[PDB]
């Protein structure tokens, strides 16, 4: 769980919206 | 003009100077090269080959704009200095600060009036003078150049491929750095990367870099209006104190 | 001369911070090598480096970015017989985006929008069995691997649509060819009807399945960057949304004219 | 304007929903 698994995670939930 | 050149030999504008088209391109530059000789099927075949070796990157038997460009402008001193720096653009705020500075009317996109603005500036930056024409010559090249889509308008990843942005910044980051010190150096890292005016807040730019550069990691390089939804969504959900900027603390709080 | 191997060595190398591209100083130091190689008496200058560089990049960076990727290296160094890559090179041009979509949607079989490891896993087997080579188990986890190494540009362990479409060498959007000038009514009737039969492969008179997909990728890349295999699932809904007014998942030719005006 | 120009506005109106 390195600090990019969140950013990756918040693109991607960003990306679906 | 590099264009009025493209437009002659792509007869009908279909994106390729191909089978006679191409024959006559070969056959127009015999003549430029020795006027004082004779055209014959030998000759044209011989420096066909020898062009299309050098400049068919494709290696479709065909001329697209591109291979045209490389065969005429690189021999231009002052088009040449469009792509030098010294520094490499590796922070994506200072590629932002260009596009919002010349992005003028805010459409997303960057129109051959604006990038004649851009051109012009960068002339200005290496106290060179161009003539007019010439100012407008290149504006037109680098439109049809780098226009990929045709609809007569650069979009951020054009303008990106021009300053030859370096995207690697958050693909350093590893999956692997999982206990909480390594997460904190990690973040302190990437907030200190964005927040180029060092005021603990992303503004402006600082905004736009960070959502390009994060929107990048999960998806292919983004437009001009990608970016100012994906901005506005970033605000909407982390700009808790609606001051329009992403303190350090907003951000901590919306990653974990 | 050079194999497969001490190609990727080359492209290690110079690829030094491991992001599938040979740019800025990485590029000037791989062209500086190359002065030494080729011309050992010679002395290295900017203006030698800027020489040779406009040469080799004239005729080797087919995507004209100022950068190379590991295809392009592999033209300019690596002999054909040693060439791992040209397994996804046919005698045909892959010139149609629907015989592409064909491939992206029986790979990404599930449509979520991405190929994962074990999905061009299976896409490495068949084309194995295409070229009836028979691959041992572990040789097609290793391929798959570097495959996916190569070819995964934000590091994410997927391929994305336009990452299939590099690998199969897709050609240019056939939609780039009609022009706005054509503005007389036969003119709109006969690009109306060379663009319908470009994409009703089938000849049904609708697009169904994979020719949906191929108009939507290239009609929304007319007006924006490549666009995401979650995008194409998302505009291909759109399209049907407001076109499909017989609700039958396809687009008849009556259906699309009408949504075009 | 040609068929291209309905492409291009059905293109950039669906991009912009
Ligand atoms: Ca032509
Ligand atoms: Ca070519
Ligand atoms: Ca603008
Ligand atoms: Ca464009
Ligand atoms: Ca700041
Ligand atoms: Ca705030
Ligand atoms: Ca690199
Ligand atoms: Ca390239
Ligand atoms: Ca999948
Ligand atoms: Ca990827
Ligand atoms: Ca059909
Ligand atoms: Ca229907
Ligand atoms: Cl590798």
Chains 1, 4 share one sequence.
Not at chain 2, 152 to 168: F, H, T, V
Request: charged share 35%; hydrophobic share 40%.
């Amino acid at each position: 769980s390195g600090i990019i698994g969140n950013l990756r995670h918040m693109a991607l939930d960003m990306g679906n919206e | 003009g590099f264009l009025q050149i493209w437009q002659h030999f792509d007869a009908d504008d279909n994106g390729y100077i191909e089978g006679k088209e191409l024959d006559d391109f070969f056959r127009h530059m015999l003549k430029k090269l020795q006027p004082k000789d004779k055209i014959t099927d030998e000759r044209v075949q011989q420096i066909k080959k020898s062009f299309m070796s050098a400049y068919d990157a494709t290696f479709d038997g065909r001329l697209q704009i591109e291979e045209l460009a490389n065969m005429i402008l690189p021999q231009e001193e002052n088009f040449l200095l469009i792509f030098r720096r010294e520094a490499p653009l590796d922070n994506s705020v200072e590629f932002m600060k260009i596009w919002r500075k010349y992005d003028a009317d805010s459409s997303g996109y960057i129109s051959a009036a604006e990038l004649k603005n851009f051109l012009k500036d960068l002339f200005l930056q290496h106290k060179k003078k161009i003539p007019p024409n010439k100012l407008d010559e290149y504006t037109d090249a680098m439109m049809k150049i780098f226009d990929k889509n045709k609809d007569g308008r650069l979009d951020l990843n054009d303008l990106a491929r021009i300053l030859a942005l370096q995207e690697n910044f958050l693909l350093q980051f590893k999956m692997d750095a999982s206990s909480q010190v390594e997460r904190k150096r990690d973040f302190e890292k990437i907030f200190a990367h964005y927040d180029v005016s060092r005021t603990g807040a992303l503004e402006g730019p600082e905004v736009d870099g960070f959502v390009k550069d994060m929107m990048e990691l999960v998806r292919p390089s983004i437009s001009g209006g990608d970016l100012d939804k994906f901005r506005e969504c970033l605000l909407t959900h982390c700009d808790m104190n609606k001051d329009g900027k992403i303190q350090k603390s907003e951000l901590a709080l919306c990653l974990g």
